[PDB]
Each structure stands twice: as C-alpha cells, then as structure tokens.
Amino acid sequence: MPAYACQRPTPLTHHNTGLSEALEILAEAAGFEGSEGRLLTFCRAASVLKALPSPVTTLSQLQGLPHFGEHSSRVVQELLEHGVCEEVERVRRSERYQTMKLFTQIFGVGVKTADRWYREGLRTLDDLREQPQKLTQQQKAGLQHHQDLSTPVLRSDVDALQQVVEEAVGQALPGATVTLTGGFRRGKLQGHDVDFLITHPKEGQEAGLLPRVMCRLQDQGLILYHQFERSFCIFRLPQPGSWKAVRVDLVVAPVSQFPFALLGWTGSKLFQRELRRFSRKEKGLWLNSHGLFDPEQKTFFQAASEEDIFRHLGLEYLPPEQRNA
DNA sequence: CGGCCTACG
DNA sequence: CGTAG
DNA sequence: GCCG
Ligand SMILES: [Mn+2]
Ligand SMILES: [Mn+2]
Ligand SMILES: [Mn+2]
Ligand SMILES: [Mn+2]
Ligand SMILES: [Mn+2]
Ligand SMILES: [Mn+2]
Ligand SMILES: [Mn+2]
Ligand code: NA
Asked: I want to staple A216 with a disulfide (CB 3.0 to 4.6 A). Which of A47, A127, A149, A168 is the partner?
C-alpha cells in the first residue's frame, strides 16, 4: 500500500465504511481545534481504509499500513471489539463539536469565525439571526438559505443546472463549453453543490467570460446570490410547484490550463492535496490548477489531458471514479 | 525534527 | 477573513 | 498524528 493517496485507486464505495467514518470524525474535530497536521493524518488513515480490497476484521491487518500509528490503531481496535470508539462518541456529543459543525457549514463562515462566535457564547442559527448587523453579506446569504443548502443535490438537479448554465455560456461566448466537475464527476449520486468548469477551444477567447455569464444568469432570475475566474453562487433551481436554493461554482480556465483545472476541480480535496504534496516532495515539481512548474529548468509543462499530467508525474492514471480519497 | 496544497474572491 | 477541489 |  503506497503512502500517498494519489498512488492508489480509491473507489467511491468500499469495504470499511464504518471505520473510515469514525476516523473522519476525529479529523473534522482536529480541524475545529486548528490542528491541520492531526486532521491530515486522520484523513489519510481513513483514506487508506477506503483503498483496501476487503474489510479489516482484526488489528493485525493494520500492520504495515501507512498512516496507522498508536492513535488511529486504537480507534479501529475499539470499533472492532466494541462496535464504538469512546473518543469518537465523546466528540460526536460534545457541544463544541456540534456547534463548530453547524457554524462552519454556513456559507461565509470558516473555522476562525465559528470559533470566535463559540467563545462569545453563541450556539444556534437563531442566535446569529438575532444580531444580523455583524454578519457579512455572504454570511447573511448563507444563513437565509441554510436549510435549502443542507438538502442534498441530486443527479436530476445537476442535469437541469447544466442546461441553464450552457444556455447562458452559449450567449456569452459562442463555442464555449461547460464540463461537470467536483464530486459528481467522481460518480457521486448526491452532493452539497455543483461544480462546473468553462473554457473555449481558442486560447484567449475565454478572457472576460465569467462576468458575461453571470449577467445573463442574473437577468434570467436564476441567481439568488453571488459576489474574475471563480464564481461561488447560489442558484434558484425549479422544483415541483416551487424551487430550492442550490450552491453552484462556476470556474473559467483557458484551454491551455484546462487539464490542470479539470484535475484540480475534480478532486477529491484530499486527492489533490496529496497529488500536490507528491509532486513537490517526490518529483520536485510545483502543481496547481493552472499548471505544473519545473523550478530547476524554470519551465511549465504543457498538458493536453489529465493523462498527460499523470504521466509527467510518473503516476499510473486514475479515472475520476478512483480519485475518491 | 519540520512538514503538512495552493490557489482565487 | 472567506471560498474551491 | 504520523512520516521520512
Ligand atoms: Mn494520541
Ligand atoms: Mn476493549
Ligand atoms: Mn462540490
Ligand atoms: Mn463547489
Ligand atoms: Mn488564473
Ligand atoms: Mn515537531
Ligand atoms: Mn467543499
Ligand atoms: Na462555511
């Protein structure tokens, strides 16, 4: 089992769901306390389990697995023995964890804001709604739409959104294309938002495109909020006899950068952090969603496909459905 | 030990 | 500060 | 918290 998540296939569904979920609770809690290192280890340990070919039944099976030390092994051992891990359950029912989770789920609120509100004594959404003067416009939008934004986005929703985005893109720039990215491109059947990547086959024609797309969506009455090359929107999506708010991300890239942006925006988040870590630490190359840089020769790699990028980095190709680290 | 991804709004 | 995978 |  290789040590980096980008070196192994990770399918969406797997054979250690309960164990991975417990470790991801501890990862999330570490993040709420500002410990990114512990968050990463627990996330990586969870991802290792997702990549295994069968269920872990006995502690012996963790021997030699990367990112399993005394702490993560004890969590698994307790789950195997007792069906529950006392530490995990303590986190789950803690006021700190529950409140940090509720607040950080709000669009516009991160760990730092949530933590300060927690220290001020705030605990519920209505607590925040009682003094709206201190909220940002982004936070006001996230709070007003929080209930809708908590309901899973379905595949049917995605197909409907893509058609309306394509119509606005077509008027903004004939020939421009729309690609579904994020978790739905990895095969997820539900999600918290929809991610789209927009380009044009003629290099440079995409310049200035996103403002033109947003204006046309806004004049169609589809934009509840927005909020350049990345737009974090809230869309009004029709429903049977009504509608619901849905988070949509629209991102533009020139065709020269499209493979890097496609790779980055398809994720998973952990997969891309690991891929960038692998690139720099093992290959001496600097990767982002714009390109791949050799700092020794001071040159950018040209890529025409995701396959090109995996080849550049010396990695076996993984389709999106195997990037669910 | 130091590192832990790397951007844009 | 927030956002993204 | 773990690696390397
Ligand atoms: Mn410990
Ligand atoms: Mn026991
Ligand atoms: Mn997404
Ligand atoms: Mn998104
Ligand atoms: Mn750019
Ligand atoms: Mn240290
Ligand atoms: Mn996200
Ligand atoms: Na948030």
From this structure: A168
Domain boundary among A213, A236, A255: A255
| HSE toward the beta carbon, residue A89, CA cutoff 13 A | 7
One domain, residues A112 and A90: no
Distance CA A67, CA A55 (A): 17
A195 is catalytic: yes
A249 labeled part of a ligand binding site: yes
Do A249 and A156 share a domain, yes or no?
A: yes
Question: For residues A107 and A233, is the Cβ–Cβ distance under 8 A?
Answer: no
Please confirm whether the linkage preceding A47 is cis (ω < 30° from 0): no
Distance CA A195, CA A179 (A): 9
Tokens of A280: 């720099």
Distance CA A54 to C1' B7 in A: 36
Q: Long-range CB contacts (< 8 A, 24+ apart) of A152-156?
A: A152/A190, A152/A191, A152/A192, A153/A190, A153/A191, A153/A192, A153/A193, A153/A194, A153/A246, A153/A247, A154/A189, A154/A190, A155/A184, A155/A189, A155/A190
Q: Is the same domain home to A135 and A78?
A: no
Do A53 and A102 lie in one domain? The reply is: no
> Could you tell me if A156 and A251 lie in one domain?
yes
- Asked if A76 and A56 touch (Cβ cutoff 8 Å), the reply is yes
Distance (Å) from CA A132 to ligand 6 centroid? 42
**Distance, CA A139 to ligand 8 centroid (Å)?**
9
* Domain span holding position A280: 256-324
Name the DSSP class of A220.
T
Please check whether residues A101 and A65 belong to one and the same domain: no
Catalytic residue among A127, A148, A249, A294, which? A249
Q: What token pair was written down for A95?
A: 């006021």
Do the annotations mark residue A195 as ligand-binding?
yes
Q: Are residues A304 and A261 in the same domain?
A: yes
Q: Using the C1' atom of nucleotide B5, identify the protein residue whose alpha carbon is closest.
A: A273
DSSP 8-state secondary structure symbol assigned to residue A202: S
A86 and A119 both lie in a single domain? no
Is A193 flagged in the annotation as binding? yes
